[PDB]
């Protein structure tokens, strides 16, 4: 039976891990002790034990202790083994240099032994959900070294990659593009699918729609957990058309180098606004295609779509799914590549999305998750290359990376590796 | 099924829409929450739980005139996204409302119109309300017609407009905006309903006997006019008349789409119940020069068309008796190329009454839409006013600093002169 | 005698067959437990065709449920007629094909076939004289369109003379639920032309047009999808499972409907589909069926028969009727439509009559027809399939399975040959 293992990395992965593992627990009914008061839909994420205790299939590995010690002192401390909360004495402190070659290597072994035993617990393994960021040194360098050792360990197993993209305007760091540029080699050759997303777009949507004018880091992670739960909803519960990971992993990636689709979830609305708004399927598919609802700050008009993945959920009927897709295709403003007039993968499930108390989204019977692979994300990496270049000319902050122990040459080669990726997307935009 | 979308613009727009949606909800039985405890598809759309949302987008540039509605009794009736406000207003400046402030919210309102088009299946009409005095309600309205024409080239867009009163005026810089709005109302509209407040003041004083009327009294009459127009769409009748039908039988030439409305009976409760009321008398009252809500005399001009809309307990026999009686009158004149200049609609349901209002509960009523040449004199007077303002180049620097080239004022004056000359050509008879 | 084995591959095949077995159980009066509560001896008359005997007056379906994913069989086992199936008829792997045709056909499905050939040989040797094999699947799946194509390849070598049909689901361009669907279909039809006596090309789109327009259903679920197929394959064998006024079986149609070995593709039909309102205004007369028989809105495929010529037409009628009007409306339709029908074959159409009506009805008909319109199905795929192939799009999932680049050109070549010969017979002189 299907199973998935969580390799949340960084403070972002830990914080999202607190949010997401809260979301599946209420989805399935697991108590904060870890016992169901009342078939095996939890088998994808939870594992039974001798005492009837259900154990999440996750590792919360960080290299600074205080972020994980909060989980150790939280309400759901009793829901893990005191092993996979793997901590470190001294962190990378926003350095890809420290997290790849010096401090990461002291707990390479223990992290790789842990993922071995969870893989040993499971019988049929589908894929790995790995959460990190492109900014933080632990989230970028350490997440890179674990991955390239995961490729040798499991050649076929799906390695989907949730990562946090630094925002075009706002930033919590100054040396983050140095970490971001070097991490692209990990996400290009050592990944199957990428879900690059910035915090800035999530700031916009909650304020405009959800009336969350002040978004704390918990509100963003709640939206992250719902997107992840929508992906695995076909695995956990039955549907008229269940779609496993390999089913949609195949149907997004035309070329091995192009595995960077864009996530979109709908509807995201408060109870004060949904009361006067009738909700059906035809308009919420239009909600996935607004430029203001894109999780990545980009314009769909600039690019064109090569592949789109629909993940409907809840009280949905396939007829109006076909009716909705009729309306979308009959539009000039929608642009599709010349070599894919049929670019759609529909996912249908029965159980509606669940709502956590103290959240933001209202209880809505139907929802849709959009996974669109377009070439409009091409400009997204163009701005970093400009941002990287105006630091690369002045040789700023290089003594930190050189002092930790890399030759300066790989900084240049990675830049060309991004640059080659840009032209590959440019070939996609060319229509014969 | 039939659908009409209201796009209220400006302070006049929001107040008139308040009136209109009020009497609409009491017409059909919608609660202030928006449920029927016990035909509505044209102006309300259904939800799952039995809620019904109005198909209106209130939009302005000054937030107070809509946040009064937000704190009003119908706050939960309206979807809050239908209420669109700007931070700063044009302050009665056409250039401000068309080229500096409007373009910020143009995308939002057009996306909203996209959403309503998605909600609707068979769309019949866009009803837009604004004024010719306010800067927002002139320039913003002009650009929204200009864009909405290319978004829906075929769809009908009726244009209810407040025309600046011949004598009284709430502003001094209003003739410039009124001059510049004419190009849009000429080349981006199918039918327009100009009306001034002065004549409605006169009607309310002479007939309905309020010595000190307010804006609500006038807006109730305008809402009654809109209700009489759309009653054929809302409910059945012996002759249902659609917007396409009465827009066909009103417009002889593309440049001439400015009918004048009329409503009857308009009288108090005691005199209403105490006088015998009949189709002949209400039809004769429709043609009285004192009951016109535009300050012009059709006896000075010639009718080219008459769109007639009875309502209530009316009979085709006395309908035709009245039409013969009206035709047998030398005072009423008709153009030579229209021996038959009438189109009559019949509706069963009598008009309803709104509390705090002015009309009595009357078993029959009538609306008239006369297309005559008598309206051009008002444009002549506003041309005289605009010329005597423009000779001294007063208040031009405001629009120039807003960023507009000066010659379009003279261009719009030329357009109005050409429209007047076309009206004169229609007035010329080939005898 | 004349026995039948129902293969079940892919999620599409599994739910369709689950409803399919439910239908015939009501037709034969078999309860969910497995016993018989009917009354007519005709119910237990030819019951061995579909089912097998068990102790305690119990009868068990002859089906092989195959799926690479173990989740679908939980839904099937939890269905209404869920316990009537055999637990080791459920032969399932642990990982799916991921809608990747090469994975099911080569990599993982080749691990599950050997267990499948065990059971399909088991049901084959129990019956003394098996009629043929029945398989339902979708061309847009990974197991049904993938390993299922391998399944028909081997079984043909083992059992050459027995018939086999496939109620395969053909993908549609206006509503496509899979982007690599033309890739899976192009590699699946090449398997179908070589080893298949007859195919019933079902398009899911036209059925949505069927229920929305003719039936007036607001929310047609996938159960209503499976009905209209489940009523269809029941109608093909209703002459086999019951005595008829003019008898037929699967072979009688098969020899009559395939003029040349390349052409075995058919669009099905069912006459009495009427909404709730339409029964108020209806006369249960057999001329009324013939319009519902011959209207293009009735078709279950995505090809208007107006644009091609009818090659061979077949009509089986389920119910008690005078068959003077079987061959009268027959002749009226052909004479009036002499232009559309092919000319080198006069009297193009077939008849068959079963005396026993459908359960809950008096009179039903099932249409099977071979026309030139079916060539519009495949060239639409080729316009779209050639699009990805020219840029080698979505190729690494296929090339990564250890397989070459030649078979994409060969499948297209075999495809492009078939339509050309099909078009050649469209433009033929008598």
């Amino acid at each position: 039976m299907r199973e998935c293992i969580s390799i949340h990395v960084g403070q972002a992965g830990v914080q999202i891990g607190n949010a997401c593992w809260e979301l599946y627990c209420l989805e399935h009914g697991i108590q904060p002790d870890g016992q169901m008061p009342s078939d095996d839909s939890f088998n994808t994420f939870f594992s039974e034990t001798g005492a009837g205790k259900h154990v999440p299939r996750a590792v919360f590995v960080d290299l600074e202790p205080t972020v994980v010690d909060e989980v150790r002192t939280g309400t759901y401390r009793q829901l893990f083994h005191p092993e996979q909360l793997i901590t470190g004495k001294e962190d990378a402190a926003n350095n890809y240099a420290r997290g790849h070659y010096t401090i990461g290597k002291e707990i390479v072994d223990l992290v790789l032994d842990r993922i071995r035993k969870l893989a040993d617990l499971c019988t049929g393994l589908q894929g790995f959900l790995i959460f990190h960021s492109f900014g933080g040194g632990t989230g970028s360098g350490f997440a890179s070294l674990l991955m390239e050792r995961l490729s040798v360990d499991y050649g076929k197993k799906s390695k989907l990659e949730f990562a946090i993209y630094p925002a075009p305007q706002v930033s919590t760091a100054v040396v983050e593009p140095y970490n971001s540029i070097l991490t692209t080699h990990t996400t290009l050759e050592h990944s199957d699918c990428a879900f690059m997303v910035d915090n800035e777009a999530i700031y916009d949507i909650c304020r405009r729609n959800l009336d969350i004018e002040r978004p704390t880091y918990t509100n963003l992670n709640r939206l992250i957990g719902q997107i992840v739960s929508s992906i695995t909803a076909s695995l956990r519960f039955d549907g008229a058309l269940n779609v496993d990971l390999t089913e949609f992993q195949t149907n997004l990636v035309p070329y091995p180098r192009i595995h960077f689709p864009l996530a979109t979830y709908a509807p995201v609305i408060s109870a004060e606004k949904a009361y006067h708004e009738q909700l059906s399927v035809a308009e919420i598919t239009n909600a996935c295609f607004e430029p203001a609802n894109q999780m990545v700050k980009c314009d769909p008009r600039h690019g064109k779509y090569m592949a789109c993945c629909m993940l409907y959920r809840g009280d949905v009927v396939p007829k109006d799914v076909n009716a909705a897709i009729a309306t979308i295709k009959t539009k000039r403003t929608i642009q599709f590549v010349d070599w894919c007039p049929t670019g759609f993968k529909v996912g249908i499930n029965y159980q509606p999305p669940t709502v956590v108390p103290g959240g933001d989204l209202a209880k809505v019977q139907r929802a849709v998750c959009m996974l669109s692979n377009t070439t409009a994300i091409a400009e997204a990496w163009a701005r970093l290359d400009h941002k990287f270049d105006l630091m690369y000319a002045k040789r700023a902050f290089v003594h930190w990376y050189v002092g930790e122990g890399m030759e300066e040459g790989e900084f240049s080669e990675a830049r060309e590796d991004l640059a080659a990726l840009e032209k590959d997307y440019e070939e996609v935009g060319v229509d014969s | 099924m039939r659908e009409c979308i209201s796009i209220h613009v400006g302070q006049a727009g929001v107040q008139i829409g308040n009136a209109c949606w009020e009497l609409y909800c009491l017409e059909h039985g919608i609660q202030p929450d928006g449920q029927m405890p016990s035909s509505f598809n044209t102006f309300f759309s259904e939800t799952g739980a039995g809620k019904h949302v109005p198909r209106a987008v209130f939009v302005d540039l000054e937030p107070t005139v809509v946040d009064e509605v937000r704190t009003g009794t119908y706050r939960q009736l309206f979807h809050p996204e239908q209420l669109i406000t700007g931070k700063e207003d044009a302050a009665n400046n056409y250039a401000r409302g068309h080229y500096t402030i409007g373009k910020e919210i143009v995308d939002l309102v057009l996306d909203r119109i996209r959403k309503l088009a998605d909600l609707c299946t068979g769309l019949q009409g866009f009803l837009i309300f604004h004024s010719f005095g306010g800067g927002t309600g002139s320039g913003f309205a002009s650009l929204l017609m200009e864009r909405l024409s290319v978004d829906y080239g075929k769809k009908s867009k009726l244009e209810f407009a407040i025309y600046p009163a011949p004598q009284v005026s709430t502003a001094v810089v209003e003739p410039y905006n009124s001059i510049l709005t004419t190009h849009t109302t000429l080349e981006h509209s199918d039918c327009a309903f100009m009306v001034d407040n002065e004549a409605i003041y006169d009607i309310c004083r002479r007939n309905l006997d309020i010595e000190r009327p307010t804006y609500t009294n006038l807006n109730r009459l305008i809402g009654q006019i809109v209700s009489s127009i759309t009653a054929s769409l809302r409910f059945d009748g012996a002759l249902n008349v659609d917007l396409t039908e009465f827009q066909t039988n009103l417009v002889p030439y593309p440049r001439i789409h400015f009918p004048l409305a009329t409503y009857a009976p308009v009288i108090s409760a005691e005199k209403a119940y105490h006088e015998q009321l009949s189709v002949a008398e209400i039809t004769n009252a429709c043609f009285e020069p004192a009951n016109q809500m535009v300050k012009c005399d059709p006896r000075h001009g010639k009718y080219m068309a008459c769109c007639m809309l009875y309502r209530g307990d009316v009979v085709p026999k006395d309908v035709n008796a009245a039409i013969a009686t009206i035709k047998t009158k030398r005072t009423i004149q008709f153009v030579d190329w229209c021996p038959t200049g009438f189109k009559v609609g019949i509706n069963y349901q009598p008009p309803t009454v709104v509390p705090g209002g002015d009309l009595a509960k009357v078993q029959r009523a009538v609306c008239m839409l006369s297309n005559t040449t008598a309206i051009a004199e008002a444009w002549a007077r506003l041309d005289h006013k605009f010329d005597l303002m423009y000779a001294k180049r007063a208040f031009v620097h405001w629009y120039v600093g807003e960023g507009m080239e000066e010659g379009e004022f003279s261009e719009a004056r030329e357009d109005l002169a050409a429209l007047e000359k076309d009206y004169e050509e229609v007035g010329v008879d080939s005898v | 005698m004349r026995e039948i084995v129902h293969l079940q591959a892919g999620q599409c095949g599994n739910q369709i067959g689950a409803k399919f077995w439910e239908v015939i159980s009501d037709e034969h009066g078999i309860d969910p437990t497995g016993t018989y509560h009917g009354d007519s001896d005709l119910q237990l008359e030819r019951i061995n065709v579909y089912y097998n005997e068990a102790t305690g007056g119990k009868y068990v379906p002859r089906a092989v449920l195959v799926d690479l994913e173990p989740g679908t069989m939980d839904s099937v086992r939890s269905g209404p007629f869920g316990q009537i199936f055999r637990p080791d008829n459920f032969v399932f792997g642990q990982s799916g094909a991921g809608n990747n045709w090469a994975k099911g056909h080569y990599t993982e499905g080749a691990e599950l076939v050997d267990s499948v050939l065990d059971v399909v040989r088991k049901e084959a040797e129990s019956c003394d004289c098996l009629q043929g094999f029945q398989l339902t699947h979708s061309l847009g799946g990974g197991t049904g369109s993938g390993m299922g194509t391998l399944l028909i390849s081997k079984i043909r070598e083992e059992y050459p003379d027995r018939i086999m049909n496939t109620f395969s689901v053909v993908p549609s361009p206006k509503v496509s639920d899979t982007v690599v669907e033309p890739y899976n279909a192009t590699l699946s039809v090449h398997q179908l032309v070589e080893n298949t006596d007859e195919t019933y090309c079902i398009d899911n789109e036209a059925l949505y047009d069927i229920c929305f327009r003719t039936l007036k259903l607001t929310t047609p679920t996938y159960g209503d999808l499976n009905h209209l197929v489940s009523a269809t394959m029941s109608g093909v064998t209703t002459c086999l499972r019951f005595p008829g006024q003019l008898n037929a079986d699967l072979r009688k149609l098969a020899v009559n409907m395939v003029p040349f070995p390349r052409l075995h593709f058919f669009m099905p039909g069912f006459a009495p589909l009427t909404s709730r309102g339409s029964q108020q205004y209806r006369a249960l007369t057999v001329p009324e069926l013939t319009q519902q028989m011959f209207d293009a809105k009735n078709m279950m495929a995505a090809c208007d028969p107006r644009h091609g010529r009818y090659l061979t037409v077949a009509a089986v009628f389920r119910g008690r009727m005078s068959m003077k009007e079987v061959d009268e409306q027959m002749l009226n339709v052909q004479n009036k439509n002499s232009s559309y029908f092919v000319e080198w074959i006069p009297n193009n159409v077939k008849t068959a009559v079963c005396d026993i009506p459908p359960r809950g009805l008096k009179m039903s008909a099932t249409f099977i027809g071979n026309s030139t319109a079916i060539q519009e199905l495949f060239k639409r795929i080729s316009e779209q399939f050639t699009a990805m192939f020219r840029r080698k799009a979505f190729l690494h999932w296929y090339t990564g399975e250890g397989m070459d680049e030649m078979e994409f050109t060969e499948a297209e070549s075999n495809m492009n040959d078939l339509v050309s010969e099909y078009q050649q017979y469209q433009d033929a002189t008598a």
């Binding site: 430029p291 403003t333 | 995308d107 | 209207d295 293009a296 809105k297």
Partner: peptide
């Protein structure tokens, strides 16, 4: 006769959901 009515459609049109909102 042969009853060929694949043509029975109503009318429905609307522009595209591409227009920017300015965050």
């Amino acid at each position: 006769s042969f009853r060929g009515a694949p043509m029975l459609l109503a009318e429905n049109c609307s522009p595209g959901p591409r227009y920017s909102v300015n965050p």
